[PDB]
Amino acid sequence: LAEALHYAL
Numbered sequence: 875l876a877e878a879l880h881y882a883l
């Protein structure tokens with residue numbers, strides 16, 4: 875989750 879989110883952002 876944490877990194878999926880950083881990527882998306």
Ligand SMILES: [Co+2]
Binds near residue numbers: 876877880
């Ligand atoms: Co990150």
